[PDB]
Structure 1
Amino acid sequence: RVKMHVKKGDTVLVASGKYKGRVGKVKEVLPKKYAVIVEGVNIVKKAVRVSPKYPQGGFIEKEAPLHASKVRPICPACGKPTRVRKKFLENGKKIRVCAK
């Protein structure tokens, strides 16, 4: 509960810092930390790997989660605050003026 926010698995712009500007599908949202994942901060883990299984495990420059606040959702007009509007039955989220 309450832990909910800005977006979810979908499409998003990053008004952040390093990746200020970039846009991308949020392949991840973890609310316990308040952090999403797009394709922005993606830094390098020199690490072999933690668990011995699967010998090699990757220097992978994997996708470093973001403060869920540095990303904004987006439509025809890109990057808008979200409004919540009620249909005739449910709750769908209109945007700064558009919808979806």
Structure 2
Amino acid sequence: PSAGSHHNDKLHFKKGDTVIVLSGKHKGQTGKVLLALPRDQKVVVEGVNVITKNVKPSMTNPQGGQEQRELALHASKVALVDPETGKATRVRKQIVDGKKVRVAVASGKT
């Protein structure tokens, strides 16, 4: 099945952005972007994570071991914010030097 790139293989955000989730259990919760894989539309943000029962043996250890770990989301979270939640986003209109197409919403830069 071809996947992820119905969104023209583009991300609506960057590797280090602060972002908020709207979706399911994690709606309204916030975190820094950590992994952004664009062609599978995956995103990892701090505090979304869960208990991966881990390799029963011999990952240099005899016994296995549960441990909490990051669990990525489809770009079902909603992206950059500044006016303090939600936020659509439009502006790509030249910072200083006039070259970088910075971001904005109904307000200022991101």
Q: What's the TM-score once normalised by structure 1's chain length?
A: 0.78
2 CA distance for matches of 1:49 and 1:76?
47
Larger radius of gyration: 2
Shift of 1:40: 4.1
CA RMSD of aligned residues (A): 2.4
- 1:95 corresponds in structure 2 to 105
Percent of matched pairs sharing the same residue: 42
2 CA distance for matches of 1:68 and 1:10?
13
- 1:37 corresponds in structure 2 to 44
From 9, 13, 20, give the equivalent of 1:7: 13
Shift of 1:65: 0.3
1:16-95 equivalence runs, <5 A: 16-48=23-55, 52-55=58-61, 58-87=65-94, 88-95=98-105
Shift of 1:76: 3.6
Gaps of 5+ in 1: none
The range that moved more, 78-87 or 14-23, is 78-87
Q: What's the TM-score once normalised by structure 2's chain length?
A: 0.72
Gaps of 5+ in 2: none
